[PDB]
Design a protein around this ligand. Structure first.
Ligand SMILES: *[C@@H]1O[C@H](CO)[C@@H](O)[C@H](O)[C@H]1NC(C)=O
Ligand SMILES: *[C@@H]1O[C@H](CO)[C@@H](O)[C@H](O)[C@H]1NC(C)=O
Ligand SMILES: *[C@@H]1O[C@H](CO)[C@@H](O)[C@H](O)[C@H]1NC(C)=O
Ligand SMILES: *[C@@H]1O[C@H](CO)[C@@H](O)[C@H](O)[C@H]1NC(C)=O
Ligand SMILES: *[C@@H]1O[C@H](CO)[C@@H](O)[C@H](O)[C@H]1NC(C)=O
Ligand SMILES: *[C@@H]1O[C@H](CO)[C@@H](O)[C@H](O)[C@H]1NC(C)=O
Ligand SMILES: *[C@@H]1O[C@H](CO)[C@@H](O)[C@H](O)[C@H]1NC(C)=O
Ligand SMILES: *[C@@H]1O[C@H](CO)[C@@H](O)[C@H](O)[C@H]1NC(C)=O
Ligand SMILES: *[C@@H]1O[C@H](CO)[C@@H](O)[C@H](O)[C@H]1NC(C)=O
Ligand SMILES: *[C@@H]1O[C@H](CO)[C@@H](O)[C@H](O)[C@H]1NC(C)=O
Ligand SMILES: [Ca+2]
Ligand SMILES: [Ca+2]
Lengths: 370, 381
């Protein structure tokens, strides 16, 4: 590594625009598998808060080495899912067969859902590398009486040891949660990816011992270990990343424990939270943690959005994005490594204020760290 | 023909590229298509696109395909970024069978300072071919130093008229020199008038290029402009430079010769359906011209994304209009919804009773940057 970070022109953004004058897009969801990637977000009209029906956009493509050796996201196929009464809540996971998407289609707002036993309807689908979208129907493995609510993402899932894994968070009664082990907790949706159809799908509860209340989340796969980023939904002020240790068997993956990384380099502005998921370049494995993050700083020295390259306890590089009036909403980042060391590219997916045209829009941006 | 139905369509893939960086702005859409070939271009700077920062120019060529549901789709084949210039680019593009030709001014000073100094600011002409090669054709030949104080093309696009490559211009010429060019004394100091850049396209290289003055008798002061070719006649849309409130479109009658194209007269079409706010460049897409401008304009049909500041309609509008009235109007929002420069063009489907119109809109991008451009698609059935 070196002490250098700069922005690069992205001539062709792989993130599609809302597609109409008053359209808004929210909730970027990204997943890449080696050189293949999948991107998804939710599109509604005027406002993206659930008061209007929405659709989901799903893109798969591949990485090419464009001008100057920087990576480029080449879109191969795009699919729009059917309209839903309110918001989509989706998580995507890229595989060699294509992109799998897990979504919740709420008919009511979040508060009304958590007060009623039973989860809102869900779908799981797949966009193949041949551009064909297959609706795999209702995700199998969901018990009615046990669960009050269940939402995937918005972060992406990962492929772990031939297992299809999605991040979830939902409401489970204390009695039913203790059995598995109304509370709000963090879950994994674990499927076996035998052929083209997922099988042996179940909801695994993550041990909430060292964790905050369940929240919007993202999965990582690093050095054959699972990490979980969580939107801070509690008084805990620091970016939350948990190390997950599993116990794998044939057609069985359960979460044994969840260890919170001691991150104090970046914080949330609250003295709720915002989903601002980092791009993890180097895992901890047990001071070596290095990550890239687009976050909102409320410090006295820096008020406003920042692009940072940070260790667990400190940030080594920071790019101010503007004054406190520059709004960024949800953010998700990921970094692509160059086999030749000492060159790192990170992409920042940013929700941007789009008023008075519509609530929000998403764009991506490219940063070089040398 | 037409009926009372217009609706918007999702543009899954916008052929208009985004500024490409967080604080980037893009301004001054310029578009041109030739049969199934199209060319698009705009100006890109950092933070602000007013000349206070260096800028580059983005240039795209592509082809039209029949996308999902039978609607037209803009497939980009190649994109080119020109070298950085100290201030703004002022560019006009013209799509041909060989590719896209771009004519630009690279001013080193602001517009007021330029019109006070004899001589035009530096200019370039280049071509982006259908083979993806960008060729820098150098300084446009045919521009006289001592006569002209300023010369700016576009931002509207040019046309291919017979074998001539034609670009819209506007610039500053001294009264004596303008009367010479016109042949007659001008009838009501540096005057601001409207010009054409006319070249013969001998093979791959334009030749015998000159600046032609448009007879300003029936016209307002020169301004940002756009060329059209309809029923083998040239039309000129002009940004309003006067108290005259209506969208200005002029009919041009030419006199063609070997290596010579001169403008014989410029007739203002009597358009009263739309007006300019305040001017702002909001150029319409003209679907059907008048078979005889001096006889009537009842056949004129056009599509326009414009700002209405009337008391009855305040805010941006999408309109399908005759010369004297608009038959369909889509409100884009309240008066707080800003659109800047505008350019539209329509693609008709003869078989079906369906017309597609694309609106290129400057949109406010604060506080990220000054401006951004997006395209939007409308179906008229
Ligand atoms: C979308 O929202 C805009 C205002 O943001 C409104 O004018 C328009 O009618 C809406 N369209 C639909 C289909 O609801
Ligand atoms: C959710 O919907 C219920 C239904 O009436 C309403 O009472 C409640 O205020 C809503 N909550 C939010 C946060 O909008
Ligand atoms: C984290 O949680 C696991 C089980 O939930 C527990 O074994 C461990 O002691 C906790 N603290 C750590 C790993 O630092
Ligand atoms: C977490 O890191 C901070 C950084 O200085 C340190 O002060 C604190 O003791 C650490 N916590 C633990 C449990 O080691
Ligand atoms: C672009 O503008 C931003 C603020 O608007 C400024 O911080 C940055 O240095 C500028 N970049 C260049 C290359 O001028
Ligand atoms: C334009 O440039 C001149 C020359 O420096 C300067 O005096 C003037 O203030 C600038 N702005 C104008 C003329 O609006
Ligand atoms: C044309 O105008 C100039 C200056 O106003 C004048 O000196 C000249 O005599 C005029 N010529 C004719 C033919 O009107
Ligand atoms: C002005 O318009 C009239 C008819 O409207 C036309 O006869 C005349 O030639 C025009 N003048 C010029 C200089 O084009
Ligand atoms: C050409 O003129 C004819 C008759 O005046 C008219 O029907 C037709 O629409 C015109 N074509 C265009 C492209 O305006
Ligand atoms: C233009 O046409 C309108 C009728 O649509 C008429 O009222 C107006 O006087 C005309 N203007 C001119 C200059 O002939
Ligand atoms: Ca419920
Ligand atoms: Ca000058």
């Amino acid at each position: 590594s070196r002490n250098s970070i700069s922005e690069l022109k992205v001539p062709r953004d792989f993130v599609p625009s809302p597609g109409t004058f008053h359209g808004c897009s929210r909730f970027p969801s990204y997943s890449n598998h080696y050189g293949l990637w999948c991107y998804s977000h939710t599109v509604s009209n005027d406002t993206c808060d659930g008061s209007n029906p929405s659709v989901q956009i799903l893109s798969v493509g591949k990485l090419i080495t464009g001008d100057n050796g920087q990576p480029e996201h080449k879109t191969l196929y795009t699919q729009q899912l059917s309209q839903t009464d309110r918001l989509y809540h989706c998580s995507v996971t890229m595989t060699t067969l294509g992109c799998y998407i897990l979504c919740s289609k709420p008919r009511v707002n979040e508060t009304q859902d958590y007060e009623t036993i039973g989860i809102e309807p869900m779908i799981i689908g797949m966009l193949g590398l041949d551009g064909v979208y297959t609706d795999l129907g209702n995700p199998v493995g969901i018990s009615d009486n046990s669960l009050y609510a269940m939402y995937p993402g918005p972060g992406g899932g990962v492929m772990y040891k031939d297992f299809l894994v999605f991040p979830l968070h939902g409401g489970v009664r204390f009695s039913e949660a203790s059995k598995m082990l109304v509370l709000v907790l963090d879950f994994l949706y674990v499927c076996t990816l035998l052929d083209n159809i997922p099988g042996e799908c179940s909801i695994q509860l993550i041990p909430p011992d060292n964790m905050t209340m369940g929240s919007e989340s993202k999965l990582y796969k690093l050095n054959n270990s699972l990490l979980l980023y969580k939107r801070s939904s509690s008084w805990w002020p620091y970016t939350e990343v948990y190390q997950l240790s599993l116990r794998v068997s044939k057609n069985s993956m359960k979460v044994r424990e969840s260890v919170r990384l001691n991150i104090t380099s970046t914080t949330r502005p609250g003295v709720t939270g915002v989903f601002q998921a980092p791009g993890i370049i180097r895992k901890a494995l047990s001071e070596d943690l290095l990550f890239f993050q687009a976050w909102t700083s409320d410090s006295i020295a820096r008020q406003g959005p920042l692009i940072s390259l940070c260790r667990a306890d400190s940030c080594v590089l920071t790019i101010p994005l503007g004054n406190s009036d520059v709004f960024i909403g949800y953010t998700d980042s990921f970094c692509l490594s160059d086999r030749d060391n000492e060159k790192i590219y990170c992409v920042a997916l940013l929700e941007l204020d789009n008023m008075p045209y519509s609530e929000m829009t998403i764009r991506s941006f490219l940063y070089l760290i040398k």
